[PDB]
Amino acid sequence: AFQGAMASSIDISKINSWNKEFQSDLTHQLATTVLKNYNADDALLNKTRLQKQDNRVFNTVVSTDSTPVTNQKSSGRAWLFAATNQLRLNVLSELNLKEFELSQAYLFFYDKLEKANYFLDQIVSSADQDIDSRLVQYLLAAPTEDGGQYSMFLNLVKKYGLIPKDLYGDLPYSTTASRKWNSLLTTKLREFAETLRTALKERSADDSIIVTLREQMQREIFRLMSLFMDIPPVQPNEQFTWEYVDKDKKIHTIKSTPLEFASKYAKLDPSTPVSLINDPRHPYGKLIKIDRLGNVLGGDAVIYLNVDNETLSKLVVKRLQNNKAVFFGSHTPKFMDKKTGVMDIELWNYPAIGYNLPQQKASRIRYHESLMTHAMLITGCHVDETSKLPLRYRVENSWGKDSGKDGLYVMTQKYFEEYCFQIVVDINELPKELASKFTSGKEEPIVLPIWDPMGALAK
Amino acid sequence: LFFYDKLEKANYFLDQIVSSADQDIDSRLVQYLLAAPTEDGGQYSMFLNLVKKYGLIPKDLYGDLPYSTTASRKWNSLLTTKLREFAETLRTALKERSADDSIIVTLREQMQREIFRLMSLFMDIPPVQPNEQFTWEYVDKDKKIHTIKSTPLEFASKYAKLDPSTPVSLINDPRHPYGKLIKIDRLGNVLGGDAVIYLNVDNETLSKLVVKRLQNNKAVFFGSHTPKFMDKKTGV
Amino acid sequence: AFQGAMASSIDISKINSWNKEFQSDLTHQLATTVLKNYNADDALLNKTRLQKQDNRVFNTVVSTDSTPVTNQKSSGRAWLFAATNQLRLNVLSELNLKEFELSQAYLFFYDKLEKANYFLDQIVSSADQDIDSRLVQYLLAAPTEDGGQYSMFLNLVKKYGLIPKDLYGDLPYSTTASRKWNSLLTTKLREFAETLRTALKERSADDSIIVTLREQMQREIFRLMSLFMDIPPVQPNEQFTWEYVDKDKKIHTIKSTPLEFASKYAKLDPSTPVSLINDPRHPYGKLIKIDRLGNVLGGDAVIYLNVDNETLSKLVVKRLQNNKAVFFGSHTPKFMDKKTGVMDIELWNYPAIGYNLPQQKASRIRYHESLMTHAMLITGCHVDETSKLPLRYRVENSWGKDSGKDGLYVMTQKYFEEYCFQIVVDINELPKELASKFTSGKEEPIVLPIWDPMGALAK
C-alpha cells in the first residue's frame, strides 16, 4: 500500500544521485550539451550513413516518368494522389504527354460528400448506443477527415470515374487548405448527429419523419460543400471534351465520360486491385476486415489480405518489372529525412546517446506506436545482382518538387519491412494460394473494430 | 515546473499501466494511457501538485534556454516511444508476477532511471532541490541591486504568495447539475498527488467571482476552447 | 635520414587503425556525428553554464548610460569608438542629453590621412633596406588600415581636438564600408613607395627633388581622400556653433573650437592617460615600446607599462567606483558569444570532446595564437561582497544595439585575465611606484619590433 506508493514515487535524492552519476560520463556530458541546442534529429543525423544510403541509382524502374511532381498541400489527400499517380502513368505514356495529372480534386469533392452522408447513416445505425460510448465518440471525432485507403478509392471510381485535372483542379482554396472547411462541416454534422439521435429516441429509422430529416440534412451538407468547391462539371456518364497537346506539339481532343475515361485511358478495371497488409499481430494468409469503415454508403468494405514481408517484397519487384508502379502505405514521417528524401531506420545515430528500440512491429502496432499515416508510390527499386533481392525503393511523394530530391524519396528494404504496412496489387499478380483467399468461399475474415490501428487512414 | 511535470507524468504512466495490467491491450483505458503519456498539457490541480512538491523559483535561475522547452514535440516523441516499450515490458512481466515482487519493483526503478536519464539529455535537472537554498540577485525599478536567499518551496509562499491550500477549480459543465463536485478518474501527474476535482457552477456565479477577484486586485486563471471564435491578429 | 622521414610520415594503415579504435568509443561516435552537422561553437555551446554566466546585475557601475549604442559597421574603428564612448559620458551627463555621440568619423578622416603620410616617411627612413626585408614588406602590408590604439588616439586629439558627431558623422559610404577606400589608397601608396625608393637610390632624403616629390604625393593622397570623405568643416582652432536640445526639451547653443571642445566638454586632458598591458612574456613594472608604430609623423611613440592582472583588475574597479569607464583591448572574438553577448572561456563544452588547451598566456602570445584585435569599454562590474573581488564586467561594444544584449556584453574576470591585454588609466590613478615609471628618468623601455604581437592594433 503506502510503501509501494512511496517506492514507486519520484524521489528527489534519487534523481539527483542519478544525475551526479550520469554527469560523470563524458558521452552523457556531450549529449546533454548538444541536445539542449538542436532538435535530436538535426543533431543526430549521421552523414557517414547518409553518404552511403542516399543512392538514386535504381536498376528496376517503370519506364514512364512522374511529370509533373504533384503537391497535395495542406490536405490529407495522399491516398488520392498516390492512387492517381499510379494510373496517370498509363495516360502519360499512351497519349505521349509531357505532363499529365488526373483530377485529385474530383475524387476529393465526392469523397467528402459521401463521407458526410455516410456519417449520418453511421449515427442512425448506432443510435441505440450511449453518446459517450467508444463507437459514437469515434464517429463524432473526424467524420469528414480527408484521409483514406484503396477500397475507399475504388468505391469513388466505381461511382464517379476519373477525369483529366485540366477540367477540374486544385483552384479552390479548400483543396490545398482543407482544415477550415472540415471544421465548418463537422460542427454542423455534430449538430445533425444530435438532431437525428433525439428524433430516433421517439421514432424508428424508417419513419417519414426520419426519412425527411435525413434528406434535408443531406441537402444542407451539399449546400455547404458547394460553397467551398464546385460540383464537378460533368456527371459520371456525361460526356466531356478534353483538348491537349502531345510531346510533338500535336493538338488532340478526346470526348469521353468520367466512367469511360477511368477505364479507357487511365486503364483502371476496379475489379482487379486488392490491398495487402503486413500486420504481424495476426496470422498471415488471413483476410482482415475493418468494421464500419467506409466513405460511400453501402460501398465495398475495407478488407485486407495479411501477408508476410518476403511475399510483399516479391510482389513489389514483380510489379515494377512488369512496368507498373505500386501504391503503398507507411508510417510517415518516422525515420524520414524530408530534406534529402531518405527513409532509413538507421540514418540517425540514436545508439550513440544510448537510445535503442527493441519493440518489434506487432508490438509497436499493439502499443499505439506505429500505424499507416500516409500513402506514396513506389516507381522503382534496385535489386542487388548478387543477392538478387531489393535493397532500396524509389518513392514518388506528393509534397511538391522541392520535397526530398526533386519530390522523390529513397526507401531502404528494412524501412519497407518495418515502417510500411500495405501495398496494392492486382489479384492476378498473386500466387493462386493467395488469390483464392479473395475468390473462394470468403475464408471468414478477422473482424477488427473501427478504432483498431489497422483501420487507420493514409493522409 | 515543466521539467518536473514531464518526469512525474512519465513515472505516473508506468504506475497507470501497472494498475491496469489486467485489462486488454486494445481496451479504451489502456489505449488512452498509451496515446500521450508525456504530453505537455495540464490543469490547476496538476499545477498545485508540482508546487507542493517542488515550489517555485525566479526564471533567472532556470529558463527556456533548452531547445525542448520551446519545441517539445520531438522530446515527447522520443520519451513516448520508450514508454510504450516499457508498458509492454511491464505488462508481460505482470502476467507472470504480482505488482509487488522484487522483479517488478526492480524493473520499475530501472525504468524510472532510464526515463530520468533521457530527460536530463534534453533539459538539466533544476540547480537547487526544493528545500535547498539559492541566491537570486536582481535590480529593482530604481536601479537598486538586491539579493534574496531562499528555497524553491519558501519562495513559492514567501514571494509568489501561493498557499497551495486555498485555490479550487470551478467549471461550467451544463451536462451536470450545478453545485456538484466532478472528479476525473485516473487523471494526474504526480503519483498519489491530488485528484482532479471540479465544482460545477453556473455562469452567473462564475462571472461574479471573476469581477470580485479583479476588484480585489487578483488576476484569474481560466480555461477555454482556443482558438474558437478567436482572431489572433486583433486579439478579439 | 630515410628512416626518420618514413617514421614521421602519415602512414595509411596507422591512421585507419587509429580510426578503428576511435570509432569504438561512444563519445567519439557521438562527437563525429554532431560535428559533421553544426559549427563546433554552435554544437558545443553549454546552456547549463550560460544559464549561470549570463548575469546582467552589476553592483558597481558608472552613472551615465551609453546612449545610443554605437555601430562602427564594416570598418576597423573600434579603438576610436571605445575611446570616444568613454568620453561622451562626460558630455551626456554635463549637458543633460538623452543621446550624444562625439564624432568618430572626424578622428577617422585625420587618422587615415596622417597614416598615409606617415607611411611615406617610414619608406623614406627604410629606403636603404631590401624590398623583401621584413620591415619594408610589413610597411607595405596595410599602411592605411583602420586599426589603432590609445597613443595613436591621443596623437589625433592633440592635433585635432574633438567635435559633436552632429557636425560630421558616418554619412559617407566609406566610414561604414572602408575596405574599398583602403584598397584604392594602398595600391597608390605602393606605387609611391617604389617611386620614392627609386629616387632615393640616386639622391639623399633632403634634396629638393625628394622634398618636391613627397609634397606632390601628399597632395595626391589628400586629393583621393577628399573624394571619399569631406575634410571636417572646421579647423582645430576654428569656432563652430552646435545647437542641441537637452532632456527637458530646452534648446542650447555652444560656440567652441574642436580643440577647446575636447577639453572643455569631453573633459580630456591628453596629458594624463597611459596604456597598461598584461604581457606575461616580459617582466612586470617595465615600459614596453613598439618600434616605428604610429599615425601622426613625430607624434607620441607607443609605450606600454607592463603590469600584472591583479593590479589591472584593481585599477579597473577603482576607476568604475570613481564613475569612469575603462577602455580595454582584447582578443575578439575568442570565447565570445555575440548572440548572448557573453565573453567566457568555458561557455563551450570543448572538454566533452576531449579538447583541452594547456598553453599559457605568454606562450599563446609568443606562438601566434593570441593578441589584441578589438577595443571596447568597461562601464561596470560586479564585486563579490564576500571575496570583495570582481566576478564579471559590463562591456559596451560598438556593433549596434542588436549585438549581444542590446549592444552590451558581459565578461568574466577570467576572460579579462586571459584574453584581454590592455586598459587605459590616468597616471594619477596609478600607485606612485608605477606612475614613476613614466615620470622619472625614463626607466629604459624594452623595445619590440613593429611586427611583435604586442604591437597589434585594435579594430
mmCIF file of N, CA, C and O in Angstrom, chain A residues 25-34 36-38 41-48 349 351-354, chain C residues 25-34 36-38 41-48 349 351-354:
data_model
loop_
_atom_site.group_PDB
_atom_site.id
_atom_site.type_symbol
_atom_site.label_atom_id
_atom_site.label_comp_id
_atom_site.label_asym_id
_atom_site.label_seq_id
_atom_site.Cartn_x
_atom_site.Cartn_y
_atom_site.Cartn_z
ATOM 1 N N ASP A 25 29.884 10.782 -16.840
ATOM 2 C CA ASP A 25 30.154 10.102 -18.079
ATOM 3 C C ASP A 25 30.343 11.164 -19.167
ATOM 4 O O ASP A 25 29.512 12.042 -19.327
ATOM 5 N N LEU A 26 31.418 11.049 -19.933
ATOM 6 C CA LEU A 26 31.738 12.011 -20.974
ATOM 7 C C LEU A 26 30.732 12.007 -22.125
ATOM 8 O O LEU A 26 30.450 13.053 -22.714
ATOM 9 N N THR A 27 30.272 10.819 -22.508
ATOM 10 C CA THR A 27 29.284 10.720 -23.573
ATOM 11 C C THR A 27 28.017 11.459 -23.115
ATOM 12 O O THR A 27 27.421 12.207 -23.883
ATOM 13 N N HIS A 28 27.647 11.294 -21.845
ATOM 14 C CA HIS A 28 26.474 11.967 -21.294
ATOM 15 C C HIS A 28 26.665 13.501 -21.278
ATOM 16 O O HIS A 28 25.770 14.263 -21.681
ATOM 17 N N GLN A 29 27.810 13.951 -20.780
ATOM 18 C CA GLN A 29 28.112 15.379 -20.736
ATOM 19 C C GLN A 29 28.003 15.973 -22.135
ATOM 20 O O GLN A 29 27.437 17.047 -22.312
ATOM 21 N N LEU A 30 28.540 15.275 -23.125
ATOM 22 C CA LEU A 30 28.492 15.751 -24.506
ATOM 23 C C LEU A 30 27.057 15.757 -25.067
ATOM 24 O O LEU A 30 26.622 16.745 -25.679
ATOM 25 N N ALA A 31 26.332 14.665 -24.839
ATOM 26 C CA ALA A 31 24.960 14.518 -25.324
ATOM 27 C C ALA A 31 24.016 15.578 -24.771
ATOM 28 O O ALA A 31 23.238 16.182 -25.518
ATOM 29 N N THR A 32 24.090 15.826 -23.468
ATOM 30 C CA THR A 32 23.218 16.818 -22.872
ATOM 31 C C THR A 32 23.556 18.241 -23.364
ATOM 32 O O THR A 32 22.680 19.094 -23.445
ATOM 33 N N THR A 33 24.820 18.486 -23.723
ATOM 34 C CA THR A 33 25.217 19.808 -24.220
ATOM 35 C C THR A 33 24.567 20.036 -25.585
ATOM 36 O O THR A 33 23.879 21.030 -25.795
ATOM 37 N N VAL A 34 24.724 19.063 -26.467
ATOM 38 C CA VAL A 34 24.199 19.148 -27.813
ATOM 39 C C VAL A 34 22.669 19.147 -27.891
ATOM 40 O O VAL A 34 22.064 19.960 -28.607
ATOM 41 N N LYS A 36 20.458 20.110 -25.864
ATOM 42 C CA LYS A 36 19.803 21.297 -25.334
ATOM 43 C C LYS A 36 19.865 22.385 -26.430
ATOM 44 O O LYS A 36 19.184 23.398 -26.346
ATOM 45 N N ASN A 37 20.623 22.133 -27.494
ATOM 46 C CA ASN A 37 20.829 23.133 -28.544
ATOM 47 C C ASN A 37 20.086 22.905 -29.836
ATOM 48 O O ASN A 37 19.735 23.860 -30.500
ATOM 49 N N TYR A 38 19.998 21.658 -30.274
ATOM 50 C CA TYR A 38 19.325 21.323 -31.529
ATOM 51 C C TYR A 38 18.326 20.209 -31.348
ATOM 52 O O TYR A 38 18.415 19.427 -30.402
ATOM 53 N N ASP A 41 16.895 15.033 -34.060
ATOM 54 C CA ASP A 41 17.084 14.553 -35.427
ATOM 55 C C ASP A 41 18.127 15.358 -36.191
ATOM 56 O O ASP A 41 18.831 14.826 -37.040
ATOM 57 N N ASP A 42 18.208 16.645 -35.889
ATOM 58 C CA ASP A 42 19.175 17.513 -36.530
ATOM 59 C C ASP A 42 20.564 17.180 -36.002
ATOM 60 O O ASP A 42 21.507 17.031 -36.750
ATOM 61 N N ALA A 43 20.648 17.054 -34.688
ATOM 62 C CA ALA A 43 21.881 16.748 -34.009
ATOM 63 C C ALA A 43 22.397 15.384 -34.400
ATOM 64 O O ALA A 43 23.581 15.231 -34.737
ATOM 65 N N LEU A 44 21.509 14.400 -34.381
ATOM 66 C CA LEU A 44 21.894 13.027 -34.647
ATOM 67 C C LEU A 44 21.964 12.522 -36.068
ATOM 68 O O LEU A 44 22.358 11.369 -36.270
ATOM 69 N N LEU A 45 21.541 13.318 -37.047
ATOM 70 C CA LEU A 45 21.665 12.888 -38.435
ATOM 71 C C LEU A 45 23.118 12.375 -38.688
ATOM 72 O O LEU A 45 24.099 13.083 -38.411
ATOM 73 N N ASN A 46 23.234 11.172 -39.249
ATOM 74 C CA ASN A 46 24.508 10.518 -39.471
ATOM 75 C C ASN A 46 24.937 10.629 -40.904
ATOM 76 O O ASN A 46 24.555 9.815 -41.737
ATOM 77 N N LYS A 47 25.784 11.606 -41.191
ATOM 78 C CA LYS A 47 26.270 11.814 -42.560
ATOM 79 C C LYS A 47 27.140 10.690 -43.113
ATOM 80 O O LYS A 47 27.206 10.502 -44.323
ATOM 81 N N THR A 48 27.772 9.914 -42.234
ATOM 82 C CA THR A 48 28.572 8.761 -42.686
ATOM 83 C C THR A 48 27.606 7.747 -43.335
ATOM 84 O O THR A 48 27.889 7.183 -44.407
ATOM 85 N N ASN A 349 21.985 8.647 -35.511
ATOM 86 C CA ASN A 349 22.787 7.936 -34.531
ATOM 87 C C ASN A 349 22.244 7.935 -33.118
ATOM 88 O O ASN A 349 22.889 8.382 -32.173
ATOM 89 N N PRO A 351 21.827 5.279 -31.318
ATOM 90 C CA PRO A 351 22.599 4.404 -30.412
ATOM 91 C C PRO A 351 23.763 5.160 -29.694
ATOM 92 O O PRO A 351 24.108 4.826 -28.555
ATOM 93 N N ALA A 352 24.300 6.218 -30.315
ATOM 94 C CA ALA A 352 25.373 6.997 -29.704
ATOM 95 C C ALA A 352 24.920 7.727 -28.444
ATOM 96 O O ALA A 352 25.754 8.192 -27.672
ATOM 97 N N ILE A 353 23.614 7.904 -28.244
ATOM 98 C CA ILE A 353 23.160 8.509 -26.985
ATOM 99 C C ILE A 353 22.504 7.384 -26.142
ATOM 100 O O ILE A 353 21.728 7.641 -25.219
ATOM 101 N N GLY A 354 22.870 6.137 -26.453
ATOM 102 C CA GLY A 354 22.306 5.004 -25.743
ATOM 103 C C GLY A 354 20.789 4.868 -25.897
ATOM 104 O O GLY A 354 20.106 4.422 -24.980
ATOM 105 N N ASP C 25 34.739 4.067 -29.463
ATOM 106 C CA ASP C 25 34.398 4.857 -28.310
ATOM 107 C C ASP C 25 33.071 5.566 -28.602
ATOM 108 O O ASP C 25 32.924 6.210 -29.627
ATOM 109 N N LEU C 26 32.129 5.474 -27.674
ATOM 110 C CA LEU C 26 30.812 6.064 -27.842
ATOM 111 C C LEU C 26 30.839 7.592 -27.879
ATOM 112 O O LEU C 26 30.047 8.215 -28.590
ATOM 113 N N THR C 27 31.676 8.191 -27.037
ATOM 114 C CA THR C 27 31.796 9.643 -27.025
ATOM 115 C C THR C 27 32.301 10.089 -28.407
ATOM 116 O O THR C 27 31.797 11.054 -28.973
ATOM 117 N N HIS C 28 33.254 9.346 -28.970
ATOM 118 C CA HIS C 28 33.792 9.661 -30.290
ATOM 119 C C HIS C 28 32.711 9.512 -31.384
ATOM 120 O O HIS C 28 32.556 10.384 -32.256
ATOM 121 N N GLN C 29 31.996 8.394 -31.363
ATOM 122 C CA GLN C 29 30.930 8.154 -32.333
ATOM 123 C C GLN C 29 29.923 9.297 -32.287
ATOM 124 O O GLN C 29 29.486 9.783 -33.325
ATOM 125 N N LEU C 30 29.559 9.726 -31.086
ATOM 126 C CA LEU C 30 28.600 10.816 -30.927
ATOM 127 C C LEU C 30 29.165 12.162 -31.419
ATOM 128 O O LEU C 30 28.491 12.902 -32.153
ATOM 129 N N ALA C 31 30.403 12.459 -31.027
ATOM 130 C CA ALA C 31 31.066 13.707 -31.400
ATOM 131 C C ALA C 31 31.223 13.871 -32.907
ATOM 132 O O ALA C 31 30.929 14.936 -33.461
ATOM 133 N N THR C 32 31.668 12.816 -33.581
ATOM 134 C CA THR C 32 31.847 12.902 -35.017
ATOM 135 C C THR C 32 30.499 13.052 -35.750
ATOM 136 O O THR C 32 30.434 13.664 -36.811
ATOM 137 N N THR C 33 29.417 12.522 -35.169
ATOM 138 C CA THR C 33 28.095 12.640 -35.794
ATOM 139 C C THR C 33 27.658 14.104 -35.748
ATOM 140 O O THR C 33 27.328 14.694 -36.771
ATOM 141 N N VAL C 34 27.746 14.695 -34.567
ATOM 142 C CA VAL C 34 27.335 16.065 -34.356
ATOM 143 C C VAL C 34 28.202 17.100 -35.082
ATOM 144 O O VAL C 34 27.688 18.029 -35.725
ATOM 145 N N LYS C 36 29.901 16.933 -37.730
ATOM 146 C CA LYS C 36 29.795 16.929 -39.183
ATOM 147 C C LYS C 36 28.523 17.725 -39.553
ATOM 148 O O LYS C 36 28.323 18.084 -40.706
ATOM 149 N N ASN C 37 27.708 18.066 -38.559
ATOM 150 C CA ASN C 37 26.429 18.734 -38.808
ATOM 151 C C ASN C 37 26.372 20.206 -38.485
ATOM 152 O O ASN C 37 25.644 20.933 -39.131
ATOM 153 N N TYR C 38 27.001 20.612 -37.392
ATOM 154 C CA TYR C 38 26.990 22.012 -36.966
ATOM 155 C C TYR C 38 28.380 22.519 -36.675
ATOM 156 O O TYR C 38 29.293 21.741 -36.406
ATOM 157 N N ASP C 41 31.174 25.573 -32.310
ATOM 158 C CA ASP C 41 30.690 26.512 -31.300
ATOM 159 C C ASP C 41 29.183 26.429 -31.100
ATOM 160 O O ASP C 41 28.685 26.642 -30.002
ATOM 161 N N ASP C 42 28.466 26.133 -32.172
ATOM 162 C CA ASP C 42 27.024 26.003 -32.107
ATOM 163 C C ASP C 42 26.676 24.714 -31.372
ATOM 164 O O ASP C 42 25.844 24.693 -30.492
ATOM 165 N N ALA C 43 27.359 23.649 -31.757
ATOM 166 C CA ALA C 43 27.161 22.344 -31.181
ATOM 167 C C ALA C 43 27.530 22.331 -29.717
ATOM 168 O O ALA C 43 26.761 21.839 -28.878
ATOM 169 N N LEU C 44 28.690 22.891 -29.406
ATOM 170 C CA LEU C 44 29.205 22.865 -28.050
ATOM 171 C C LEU C 44 28.781 23.921 -27.059
ATOM 172 O O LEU C 44 29.182 23.838 -25.893
ATOM 173 N N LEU C 45 28.038 24.938 -27.491
ATOM 174 C CA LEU C 45 27.551 25.934 -26.544
ATOM 175 C C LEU C 45 26.893 25.209 -25.327
ATOM 176 O O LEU C 45 26.000 24.365 -25.498
ATOM 177 N N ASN C 46 27.312 25.580 -24.118
ATOM 178 C CA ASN C 46 26.865 24.947 -22.894
ATOM 179 C C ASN C 46 25.830 25.779 -22.195
ATOM 180 O O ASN C 46 26.162 26.673 -21.424
ATOM 181 N N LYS C 47 24.566 25.451 -22.414
ATOM 182 C CA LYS C 47 23.468 26.196 -21.787
ATOM 183 C C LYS C 47 23.395 26.079 -20.268
ATOM 184 O O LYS C 47 22.875 26.974 -19.608
ATOM 185 N N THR C 48 23.950 25.007 -19.707
ATOM 186 C CA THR C 48 23.987 24.858 -18.240
ATOM 187 C C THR C 48 24.882 25.984 -17.678
ATOM 188 O O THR C 48 24.542 26.637 -16.676
ATOM 189 N N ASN C 349 31.510 23.517 -24.281
ATOM 190 C CA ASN C 349 31.974 22.258 -23.726
ATOM 191 C C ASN C 349 32.996 21.513 -24.558
ATOM 192 O O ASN C 349 32.799 20.370 -24.961
ATOM 193 N N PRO C 351 35.825 20.416 -23.435
ATOM 194 C CA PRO C 351 36.375 19.235 -22.739
ATOM 195 C C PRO C 351 35.562 17.933 -23.031
ATOM 196 O O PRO C 351 36.136 16.838 -23.058
ATOM 197 N N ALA C 352 34.264 18.060 -23.333
ATOM 198 C CA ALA C 352 33.436 16.898 -23.646
ATOM 199 C C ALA C 352 33.865 16.207 -24.937
ATOM 200 O O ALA C 352 33.458 15.077 -25.190
ATOM 201 N N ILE C 353 34.623 16.882 -25.800
ATOM 202 C CA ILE C 353 35.131 16.194 -26.994
ATOM 203 C C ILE C 353 36.652 15.972 -26.788
ATOM 204 O O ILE C 353 37.404 15.752 -27.740
ATOM 205 N N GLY C 354 37.074 15.991 -25.521
ATOM 206 C CA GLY C 354 38.481 15.814 -25.211
ATOM 207 C C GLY C 354 39.388 16.899 -25.796
ATOM 208 O O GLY C 354 40.530 16.631 -26.157
#
